[PDB]
PDB file of C-alpha atoms and ligand atoms in Angstrom:
ATOM      1  CA  UNK K   1     100.192  94.699  92.530  1.00  0.00           C
ATOM      2  CA  UNK K   2     103.101  92.966  93.463  1.00  0.00           C
ATOM      3  CA  UNK K   3     104.227  89.146  93.371  1.00  0.00           C
ATOM      4  CA  UNK K   4     102.603  86.782  95.667  1.00  0.00           C
ATOM      5  CA  UNK K   5     101.106  83.783  96.478  1.00  0.00           C
ATOM      6  CA  UNK K   6      97.251  84.675  95.494  1.00  0.00           C
ATOM      7  CA  UNK K   7      95.079  83.648  92.790  1.00  0.00           C
ATOM      8  CA  UNK K   8      96.055  87.063  91.004  1.00  0.00           C
ATOM      9  CA  UNK K   9      99.574  87.308  91.505  1.00  0.00           C
ATOM     10  CA  UNK K  10     101.028  84.102  91.986  1.00  0.00           C
ATOM     11  CA  UNK K  11     103.222  81.574  90.314  1.00  0.00           C
ATOM     12  CA  UNK K  12     101.549  81.659  87.122  1.00  0.00           C
ATOM     13  CA  UNK K  13     101.595  85.357  86.787  1.00  0.00           C
ATOM     14  CA  UNK K  14     105.496  85.684  87.925  1.00  0.00           C
ATOM     15  CA  UNK K  15     106.941  85.753  84.208  1.00  0.00           C
ATOM     16  CA  UNK K  16     105.374  89.103  83.392  1.00  0.00           C
ATOM     17  CA  UNK K  17     107.746  91.073  85.553  1.00  0.00           C
ATOM     18  CA  UNK K  18     110.361  88.075  86.094  1.00  0.00           C
ATOM     19  CA  UNK K  19     110.670  86.512  82.454  1.00  0.00           C
ATOM     20  CA  UNK K  20     113.678  84.192  83.717  1.00  0.00           C
ATOM     21  CA  UNK K  21     110.517  82.454  85.445  1.00  0.00           C
ATOM     22  CA  UNK K  22     110.462  80.925  82.102  1.00  0.00           C
ATOM     23  CA  UNK K  23     114.521  79.952  81.976  1.00  0.00           C
ATOM     24  CA  UNK K  24     116.589  77.113  81.585  1.00  0.00           C
ATOM     25  CA  UNK K  25     117.707  76.343  85.288  1.00  0.00           C
ATOM     26  CA  UNK K  26     114.182  77.274  87.142  1.00  0.00           C
ATOM     27  CA  UNK K  27     113.458  75.684  90.478  1.00  0.00           C
ATOM     28  CA  UNK K  28     112.084  73.985  92.088  1.00  0.00           C
ATOM     29  CA  UNK K  29     112.018  70.734  90.070  1.00  0.00           C
ATOM     30  CA  UNK K  30     110.439  67.258  90.435  1.00  0.00           C
ATOM     31  CA  UNK K  31     113.343  64.827  91.534  1.00  0.00           C
ATOM     32  CA  UNK K  32     112.310  61.322  89.888  1.00  0.00           C
ATOM     33  CA  UNK K  33     114.498  58.918  92.022  1.00  0.00           C
ATOM     34  CA  UNK K  34     115.052  56.583  89.248  1.00  0.00           C
ATOM     35  CA  UNK K  35     116.579  58.929  86.824  1.00  0.00           C
ATOM     36  CA  UNK K  36     118.927  60.761  89.182  1.00  0.00           C
ATOM     37  CA  UNK K  37     122.392  59.330  88.624  1.00  0.00           C
ATOM     38  CA  UNK K  38     124.961  58.155  91.658  1.00  0.00           C
ATOM     39  CA  UNK K  39     127.941  60.454  91.257  1.00  0.00           C
ATOM     40  CA  UNK K  40     130.816  58.642  92.941  1.00  0.00           C
ATOM     41  CA  UNK K  41     132.362  61.916  92.470  1.00  0.00           C
ATOM     42  CA  UNK K  42     130.448  63.605  94.574  1.00  0.00           C
ATOM     43  CA  UNK K  43     131.922  64.571  98.353  1.00  0.00           C
ATOM     44  CA  UNK K  44     129.907  64.121 101.737  1.00  0.00           C
ATOM     45  CA  UNK K  45     128.759  67.519 102.668  1.00  0.00           C
ATOM     46  CA  UNK K  46     130.158  69.580 105.094  1.00  0.00           C
ATOM     47  CA  UNK K  47     127.963  71.357 107.072  1.00  0.00           C
ATOM     48  CA  UNK K  48     129.847  73.675 110.021  1.00  0.00           C
ATOM     49  CA  UNK K  49     127.057  75.298 111.875  1.00  0.00           C
ATOM     50  CA  UNK K  50     129.107  75.134 115.414  1.00  0.00           C
ATOM     51  CA  UNK K  51     129.249  78.997 115.343  1.00  0.00           C
ATOM     52  CA  UNK K  52     126.392  80.191 113.599  1.00  0.00           C
ATOM     53  CA  UNK K  53     124.824  83.701 115.199  1.00  0.00           C
ATOM     54  CA  UNK K  54     121.536  83.750 114.840  1.00  0.00           C
ATOM     55  CA  UNK K  55     120.347  87.236 114.735  1.00  0.00           C
ATOM     56  CA  UNK K  56     116.723  88.199 114.238  1.00  0.00           C
ATOM     57  CA  UNK K  57     113.468  86.649 112.567  1.00  0.00           C
ATOM     58  CA  UNK K  58     111.560  88.703 109.820  1.00  0.00           C
ATOM     59  CA  UNK K  59     108.102  88.025 108.459  1.00  0.00           C
ATOM     60  CA  UNK K  60     108.808  89.755 105.043  1.00  0.00           C
ATOM     61  CA  UNK K  61     105.116  88.749 103.465  1.00  0.00           C
ATOM     62  CA  UNK K  62     106.265  85.790 101.757  1.00  0.00           C
ATOM     63  CA  UNK K  63     107.644  83.489 104.958  1.00  0.00           C
ATOM     64  CA  UNK K  64     109.516  84.400 107.734  1.00  0.00           C
ATOM     65  CA  UNK K  65     113.287  84.172 107.542  1.00  0.00           C
ATOM     66  CA  UNK K  66     115.649  83.610 110.425  1.00  0.00           C
ATOM     67  CA  UNK K  67     118.819  85.604 109.804  1.00  0.00           C
ATOM     68  CA  UNK K  68     122.179  85.031 110.585  1.00  0.00           C
ATOM     69  CA  UNK K  69     125.431  87.254 111.516  1.00  0.00           C
ATOM     70  CA  UNK K  70     127.008  86.542 107.952  1.00  0.00           C
ATOM     71  CA  UNK K  71     130.154  89.069 108.358  1.00  0.00           C
ATOM     72  CA  UNK K  72     132.546  86.130 109.376  1.00  0.00           C
ATOM     73  CA  UNK K  73     133.269  82.740 108.555  1.00  0.00           C
ATOM     74  CA  UNK K  74     131.131  81.325 111.228  1.00  0.00           C
ATOM     75  CA  UNK K  75     128.530  79.080 109.653  1.00  0.00           C
ATOM     76  CA  UNK K  76     129.288  77.587 106.493  1.00  0.00           C
ATOM     77  CA  UNK K  77     128.498  74.875 103.878  1.00  0.00           C
ATOM     78  CA  UNK K  78     131.057  73.441 101.712  1.00  0.00           C
ATOM     79  CA  UNK K  79     132.032  69.875 100.066  1.00  0.00           C
ATOM     80  CA  UNK K  80     129.373  67.958  98.444  1.00  0.00           C
ATOM     81  CA  UNK K  81     129.075  69.340  94.938  1.00  0.00           C
ATOM     82  CA  UNK K  82     130.704  72.632  95.602  1.00  0.00           C
ATOM     83  CA  UNK K  83     133.952  74.073  94.830  1.00  0.00           C
ATOM     84  CA  UNK K  84     134.688  76.703  97.885  1.00  0.00           C
ATOM     85  CA  UNK K  85     133.150  77.956 101.145  1.00  0.00           C
ATOM     86  CA  UNK K  86     129.384  79.161 101.204  1.00  0.00           C
ATOM     87  CA  UNK K  87     128.351  81.133 104.263  1.00  0.00           C
ATOM     88  CA  UNK K  88     124.774  81.016 106.053  1.00  0.00           C
ATOM     89  CA  UNK K  89     122.860  84.092 105.512  1.00  0.00           C
ATOM     90  CA  UNK K  90     119.176  82.884 106.438  1.00  0.00           C
ATOM     91  CA  UNK K  91     116.983  80.155 106.557  1.00  0.00           C
ATOM     92  CA  UNK K  92     112.998  79.885 105.832  1.00  0.00           C
ATOM     93  CA  UNK K  93     110.266  77.419 105.233  1.00  0.00           C
ATOM     94  CA  UNK K  94     107.562  76.986 102.305  1.00  0.00           C
ATOM     95  CA  UNK K  95     104.361  75.187 103.847  1.00  0.00           C
ATOM     96  CA  UNK K  96     100.969  74.173 102.859  1.00  0.00           C
ATOM     97  CA  UNK K  97      97.386  74.869 103.848  1.00  0.00           C
ATOM     98  CA  UNK K  98      97.065  71.114 104.369  1.00  0.00           C
ATOM     99  CA  UNK K  99      99.653  68.333 105.125  1.00  0.00           C
ATOM    100  CA  UNK K 100      99.542  66.662 102.124  1.00  0.00           C
ATOM    101  CA  UNK K 101     101.377  70.155 100.278  1.00  0.00           C
ATOM    102  CA  UNK K 102     103.720  72.705 100.803  1.00  0.00           C
ATOM    103  CA  UNK K 103     107.279  71.587  99.730  1.00  0.00           C
ATOM    104  CA  UNK K 104     108.451  73.224  96.551  1.00  0.00           C
ATOM    105  CA  UNK K 105     110.938  70.049  95.508  1.00  0.00           C
ATOM    106  CA  UNK K 106     108.713  66.983  94.805  1.00  0.00           C
ATOM    107  CA  UNK K 107     109.939  63.469  95.067  1.00  0.00           C
ATOM    108  CA  UNK K 108     108.720  60.989  92.247  1.00  0.00           C
ATOM    109  CA  UNK K 109     105.928  63.589  92.549  1.00  0.00           C
ATOM    110  CA  UNK K 110     105.379  63.366  96.197  1.00  0.00           C
ATOM    111  CA  UNK K 111     104.498  66.743  98.247  1.00  0.00           C
ATOM    112  CA  UNK K 112     105.868  67.346 101.851  1.00  0.00           C
ATOM    113  CA  UNK K 113     104.191  69.035 104.259  1.00  0.00           C
ATOM    114  CA  UNK K 114     106.812  71.695 104.021  1.00  0.00           C
ATOM    115  CA  UNK K 115     110.555  72.685 102.835  1.00  0.00           C
ATOM    116  CA  UNK K 116     113.196  74.343 104.738  1.00  0.00           C
ATOM    117  CA  UNK K 117     115.990  76.224 102.528  1.00  0.00           C
ATOM    118  CA  UNK K 118     119.563  76.927 104.585  1.00  0.00           C
ATOM    119  CA  UNK K 119     120.838  79.719 102.033  1.00  0.00           C
ATOM    120  CA  UNK K 120     124.225  80.188 102.027  1.00  0.00           C
ATOM    121  CA  UNK K 121     126.340  82.475  99.632  1.00  0.00           C
ATOM    122  CA  UNK K 122     129.822  82.098  97.858  1.00  0.00           C
ATOM    123  CA  UNK K 123     132.601  83.736  99.938  1.00  0.00           C
ATOM    124  CA  UNK K 124     134.296  84.611  96.422  1.00  0.00           C
ATOM    125  CA  UNK K 125     131.831  86.671  95.711  1.00  0.00           C
ATOM    126  CA  UNK K 126     132.180  89.107  98.975  1.00  0.00           C
ATOM    127  CA  UNK K 127     128.468  89.365  99.811  1.00  0.00           C
ATOM    128  CA  UNK K 128     125.112  88.154  98.663  1.00  0.00           C
ATOM    129  CA  UNK K 129     124.172  90.815  96.552  1.00  0.00           C
ATOM    130  CA  UNK K 130     127.282  90.231  94.103  1.00  0.00           C
ATOM    131  CA  UNK K 131     126.703  86.398  94.778  1.00  0.00           C
ATOM    132  CA  UNK K 132     123.070  86.348  93.264  1.00  0.00           C
ATOM    133  CA  UNK K 133     124.502  87.478  90.086  1.00  0.00           C
ATOM    134  CA  UNK K 134     126.720  84.511  89.737  1.00  0.00           C
ATOM    135  CA  UNK K 135     125.637  81.078  88.219  1.00  0.00           C
ATOM    136  CA  UNK K 136     127.580  79.445  91.484  1.00  0.00           C
ATOM    137  CA  UNK K 137     126.802  82.289  93.721  1.00  0.00           C
ATOM    138  CA  UNK K 138     124.482  80.477  96.252  1.00  0.00           C
ATOM    139  CA  UNK K 139     123.875  76.818  97.452  1.00  0.00           C
ATOM    140  CA  UNK K 140     120.680  76.107  99.163  1.00  0.00           C
ATOM    141  CA  UNK K 141     120.506  72.947 101.262  1.00  0.00           C
ATOM    142  CA  UNK K 142     116.556  72.028 101.377  1.00  0.00           C
ATOM    143  CA  UNK K 143     114.855  69.563 103.702  1.00  0.00           C
ATOM    144  CA  UNK K 144     111.707  68.390 103.754  1.00  0.00           C
ATOM    145  CA  UNK K 145     109.343  68.842 106.782  1.00  0.00           C
ATOM    146  CA  UNK K 146     106.919  65.796 106.943  1.00  0.00           C
ATOM    147  CA  UNK K 147     104.090  65.713 109.697  1.00  0.00           C
ATOM    148  CA  UNK K 148     104.468  63.203 112.837  1.00  0.00           C
ATOM    149  CA  UNK K 149     106.795  63.670 116.073  1.00  0.00           C
ATOM    150  CA  UNK K 150     107.935  67.045 116.979  1.00  0.00           C
ATOM    151  CA  UNK K 151     111.141  68.448 116.148  1.00  0.00           C
ATOM    152  CA  UNK K 152     112.379  69.738 119.297  1.00  0.00           C
ATOM    153  CA  UNK K 153     115.070  72.087 117.558  1.00  0.00           C
ATOM    154  CA  UNK K 154     112.446  73.772 115.859  1.00  0.00           C
ATOM    155  CA  UNK K 155     110.257  75.076 118.890  1.00  0.00           C
ATOM    156  CA  UNK K 156     112.014  78.248 119.469  1.00  0.00           C
ATOM    157  CA  UNK K 157     111.364  79.399 116.242  1.00  0.00           C
ATOM    158  CA  UNK K 158     107.476  78.435 116.178  1.00  0.00           C
ATOM    159  CA  UNK K 159     107.337  79.704 120.021  1.00  0.00           C
ATOM    160  CA  UNK K 160     108.126  83.110 118.192  1.00  0.00           C
ATOM    161  CA  UNK K 161     105.679  83.488 115.747  1.00  0.00           C
ATOM    162  CA  UNK K 162     103.035  85.047 117.436  1.00  0.00           C
ATOM    163  CA  UNK K 163     105.297  88.378 117.753  1.00  0.00           C
ATOM    164  CA  UNK K 164     105.947  88.345 113.808  1.00  0.00           C
ATOM    165  CA  UNK K 165     102.399  87.641 112.854  1.00  0.00           C
ATOM    166  CA  UNK K 166     101.906  90.174 110.361  1.00  0.00           C
ATOM    167  CA  UNK K 167     104.034  91.630 107.213  1.00  0.00           C
ATOM    168  CA  UNK K 168     107.258  93.608 108.142  1.00  0.00           C
ATOM    169  CA  UNK K 169     107.153  92.643 111.602  1.00  0.00           C
ATOM    170  CA  UNK K 170     110.668  91.428 113.054  1.00  0.00           C
ATOM    171  CA  UNK K 171     112.231  90.047 116.361  1.00  0.00           C
ATOM    172  CA  UNK K 172     114.994  89.425 118.294  1.00  0.00           C
ATOM    173  CA  UNK K 173     116.211  85.767 117.839  1.00  0.00           C
ATOM    174  CA  UNK K 174     119.819  85.259 119.256  1.00  0.00           C
ATOM    175  CA  UNK K 175     121.379  82.030 120.008  1.00  0.00           C
ATOM    176  CA  UNK K 176     119.396  79.669 117.610  1.00  0.00           C
ATOM    177  CA  UNK K 177     121.373  76.428 116.653  1.00  0.00           C
ATOM    178  CA  UNK K 178     120.300  75.330 113.254  1.00  0.00           C
ATOM    179  CA  UNK K 179     122.191  72.015 113.702  1.00  0.00           C
ATOM    180  CA  UNK K 180     118.887  71.323 115.764  1.00  0.00           C
ATOM    181  CA  UNK K 181     116.784  70.959 112.113  1.00  0.00           C
ATOM    182  CA  UNK K 182     119.191  68.674 110.429  1.00  0.00           C
ATOM    183  CA  UNK K 183     118.050  64.870 109.617  1.00  0.00           C
ATOM    184  CA  UNK K 184     120.544  62.191 110.479  1.00  0.00           C
ATOM    185  CA  UNK K 185     122.103  61.597 107.146  1.00  0.00           C
ATOM    186  CA  UNK K 186     123.443  64.113 104.564  1.00  0.00           C
ATOM    187  CA  UNK K 187     122.919  62.076 101.610  1.00  0.00           C
ATOM    188  CA  UNK K 188     121.574  64.247  98.886  1.00  0.00           C
ATOM    189  CA  UNK K 189     120.650  65.164  95.533  1.00  0.00           C
ATOM    190  CA  UNK K 190     121.998  68.170  93.548  1.00  0.00           C
ATOM    191  CA  UNK K 191     121.331  70.063  90.112  1.00  0.00           C
ATOM    192  CA  UNK K 192     121.573  73.620  89.011  1.00  0.00           C
ATOM    193  CA  UNK K 193     118.846  75.744  89.394  1.00  0.00           C
ATOM    194  CA  UNK K 194     117.445  79.234  90.742  1.00  0.00           C
ATOM    195  CA  UNK K 195     115.938  81.138  93.403  1.00  0.00           C
ATOM    196  CA  UNK K 196     112.190  80.039  93.992  1.00  0.00           C
ATOM    197  CA  UNK K 197     110.707  83.486  94.563  1.00  0.00           C
ATOM    198  CA  UNK K 198     111.136  86.412  92.366  1.00  0.00           C
ATOM    199  CA  UNK K 199     113.635  87.554  91.298  1.00  0.00           C
ATOM    200  CA  UNK K 200     114.016  84.031  90.119  1.00  0.00           C
ATOM    201  CA  UNK K 201     117.742  84.400  89.574  1.00  0.00           C
ATOM    202  CA  UNK K 202     119.482  81.177  88.374  1.00  0.00           C
ATOM    203  CA  UNK K 203     122.380  81.631  90.693  1.00  0.00           C
ATOM    204  CA  UNK K 204     121.880  78.128  92.884  1.00  0.00           C
ATOM    205  CA  UNK K 205     123.405  75.330  93.309  1.00  0.00           C
ATOM    206  CA  UNK K 206     120.616  73.088  95.103  1.00  0.00           C
ATOM    207  CA  UNK K 207     121.251  70.417  97.211  1.00  0.00           C
ATOM    208  CA  UNK K 208     118.101  68.657  98.875  1.00  0.00           C
ATOM    209  CA  UNK K 209     118.632  66.257 101.477  1.00  0.00           C
ATOM    210  CA  UNK K 210     116.880  62.845 100.772  1.00  0.00           C
ATOM    211  CA  UNK K 211     115.662  62.104 104.571  1.00  0.00           C
ATOM    212  CA  UNK K 212     112.988  64.577 105.712  1.00  0.00           C
ATOM    213  CA  UNK K 213     112.737  65.688 109.222  1.00  0.00           C
ATOM    214  CA  UNK K 214     109.631  65.120 111.448  1.00  0.00           C
ATOM    215  CA  UNK K 215     107.805  68.096 112.772  1.00  0.00           C
ATOM    216  CA  UNK K 216     104.401  67.464 114.693  1.00  0.00           C
ATOM    217  CA  UNK K 217     100.879  68.742 113.597  1.00  0.00           C
ATOM    218  CA  UNK K 218     100.683  71.496 116.293  1.00  0.00           C
ATOM    219  CA  UNK K 219     104.336  73.123 115.055  1.00  0.00           C
ATOM    220  CA  UNK K 220     103.098  72.898 111.505  1.00  0.00           C
ATOM    221  CA  UNK K 221      99.662  74.533 112.753  1.00  0.00           C
ATOM    222  CA  UNK K 222     101.475  77.280 114.161  1.00  0.00           C
ATOM    223  CA  UNK K 223     103.254  78.381 110.701  1.00  0.00           C
ATOM    224  CA  UNK K 224      99.961  78.360 108.777  1.00  0.00           C
ATOM    225  CA  UNK K 225      98.589  81.324 111.636  1.00  0.00           C
ATOM    226  CA  UNK K 226     100.927  83.593 110.186  1.00  0.00           C
ATOM    227  CA  UNK K 227      99.713  86.189 107.928  1.00  0.00           C
ATOM    228  CA  UNK K 228     100.739  87.639 104.534  1.00  0.00           C
ATOM    229  CA  UNK K 229      99.084  90.992 105.095  1.00  0.00           C
ATOM    230  CA  UNK K 230     100.525  93.594 107.338  1.00  0.00           C
ATOM    231  CA  UNK K 231      98.946  94.668 110.449  1.00  0.00           C
ATOM    232  CA  UNK K 232      95.931  96.296 110.331  1.00  0.00           C
ATOM    233  CA  UNK K 233      95.031  94.914 106.897  1.00  0.00           C
ATOM    234  CA  UNK K 234      92.456  92.309 105.826  1.00  0.00           C
ATOM    235  CA  UNK K 235      93.764  88.857 107.466  1.00  0.00           C
ATOM    236  CA  UNK K 236      95.141  86.481 104.367  1.00  0.00           C
ATOM    237  CA  UNK K 237      96.653  83.347 106.174  1.00  0.00           C
ATOM    238  CA  UNK K 238     100.393  82.525 105.109  1.00  0.00           C
ATOM    239  CA  UNK K 239      99.887  79.287 103.510  1.00  0.00           C
ATOM    240  CA  UNK K 240     100.681  78.040 100.274  1.00  0.00           C
ATOM    241  CA  UNK K 241     104.082  79.807  99.649  1.00  0.00           C
ATOM    242  CA  UNK K 242     105.159  77.326  97.500  1.00  0.00           C
ATOM    243  CA  UNK K 243     106.430  77.695  93.786  1.00  0.00           C
ATOM    244  CA  UNK K 244     105.358  74.068  91.829  1.00  0.00           C
ATOM    245  CA  UNK K 245     107.519  72.152  89.985  1.00  0.00           C
ATOM    246  CA  UNK K 246     109.255  73.838  86.890  1.00  0.00           C
ATOM    247  CA  UNK K 247     110.428  72.083  83.644  1.00  0.00           C
ATOM    248  CA  UNK K 248     113.636  70.249  84.083  1.00  0.00           C
ATOM    249  CA  UNK K 249     114.813  70.920  80.753  1.00  0.00           C
ATOM    250  CA  UNK K 250     118.314  70.054  80.117  1.00  0.00           C
ATOM    251  CA  UNK K 251     119.541  69.101  83.352  1.00  0.00           C
ATOM    252  CA  UNK K 252     120.874  66.241  85.283  1.00  0.00           C
ATOM    253  CA  UNK K 253     119.875  65.384  88.865  1.00  0.00           C
ATOM    254  CA  UNK K 254     122.739  63.674  90.926  1.00  0.00           C
ATOM    255  CA  UNK K 255     122.591  61.497  93.856  1.00  0.00           C
ATOM    256  CA  UNK K 256     125.517  61.274  96.407  1.00  0.00           C
ATOM    257  CA  UNK K 257     124.194  57.727  97.263  1.00  0.00           C
ATOM    258  CA  UNK K 258     123.383  54.657  96.138  1.00  0.00           C
TER     259      UNK K 258
HETATM  260  C1  LIG L   1     117.396  94.185  97.240  1.00  0.00           C
HETATM  261  O1  LIG L   1     116.611  92.575  97.513  1.00  0.00           O
HETATM  262  C2  LIG L   1     116.625  92.083  98.566  1.00  0.00           C
HETATM  263  C3  LIG L   1     117.027  93.238  99.432  1.00  0.00           C
HETATM  264  C4  LIG L   1     117.325  92.729 101.034  1.00  0.00           C
HETATM  265  C5  LIG L   1     117.172  91.322 101.483  1.00  0.00           C
HETATM  266  C6  LIG L   1     116.905  90.336  99.905  1.00  0.00           C
HETATM  267  C7  LIG L   1     116.917  89.034 100.268  1.00  0.00           C
HETATM  268  C8  LIG L   1     117.135  88.252  98.886  1.00  0.00           C
HETATM  269  C9  LIG L   1     117.025  86.663  99.103  1.00  0.00           C
HETATM  270  O2  LIG L   1     117.722  86.051  99.941  1.00  0.00           O
HETATM  271  N1  LIG L   1     115.915  86.387  98.119  1.00  0.00           N
HETATM  272  C10 LIG L   1     115.662  84.610  98.108  1.00  0.00           C
HETATM  273  C11 LIG L   1     116.450  83.794  98.917  1.00  0.00           C
HETATM  274  C12 LIG L   1     116.293  82.555  98.729  1.00  0.00           C
HETATM  275  C13 LIG L   1     115.531  81.748  97.953  1.00  0.00           C
HETATM  276  S1  LIG L   1     114.936  80.038  97.871  1.00  0.00           S
HETATM  277  N2  LIG L   1     113.308  80.196  97.840  1.00  0.00           N
HETATM  278  O3  LIG L   1     116.007  79.214  99.154  1.00  0.00           O
HETATM  279  O4  LIG L   1     115.121  79.771  96.404  1.00  0.00           O
HETATM  280  C14 LIG L   1     114.912  82.579  97.420  1.00  0.00           C
HETATM  281  C15 LIG L   1     114.853  84.274  97.415  1.00  0.00           C
HETATM  282  C16 LIG L   1     116.275  89.040  97.377  1.00  0.00           C
HETATM  283  O5  LIG L   1     116.302  88.210  96.719  1.00  0.00           O
HETATM  284  O6  LIG L   1     116.801  90.004  97.932  1.00  0.00           O
HETATM  285  C17 LIG L   1     116.907  90.853  98.750  1.00  0.00           C
HETATM  286 ZN1  LIG L   2     112.753  78.939  99.770  1.00  0.00          ZN
END
């Protein structure tokens, strides 16, 4: 009886195995755009993905992860609110059963159809598993998805999903360029938070872009054909794999833009 997104094991149950679920810096949160303060001290975000080397795509039973070779300094996030260098390890999405929900962060209570998380670890801690034990261990770049025009740079991901339908399936996934998933603007909000899935560790500097990307209805429909279950188990569609907004408590959300 492990955690998930079903009626019996979903977000409202996670605290029993992971008491930090009720902690002081949990994610996601609602971004109240009128109370987020413009911080002129925030730097432009530096996203340097020219040399990113994807390796594989994995259905882990909760989402699918596009994994990167993070053994050299090759796909790094710097600047913004960050001190030092953070290396890309994987990206994944959270999405809904319907276009009206799916994102984890919300903007003035607005839910987007999906949310992309590009996960990076602070190179001062040497690798990901050590980084997650630190309050500045990770930087997650969050990007909202709305349904409209197709995102041409997403289609290579969409088309491989048939080969990883069920939990534990993986597939070679080389030469994928994550620059094709970015919006035009790098304007962002930032706040200190957590992993949004167990173990819910409070190790993330969140950087949430203001500008959503557009994906087509057909693209997101293919996400919704994935399965939470393993091969040869009762089919449970992989939908609504998002954690709702958590209490902000004693935190400030800062805006990079006026
Ligand atoms: C020993 O546990 C693991 C073994 C092998 C791989 C992993 C990967 C992990 C991981 O990246 N978790 C993760 C990453 C990102 C987020 S989120 N949704 O971006 O906040 C939430 C959870 C993780 O927490 O634990 C892992
Ligand atoms: Zn995530």
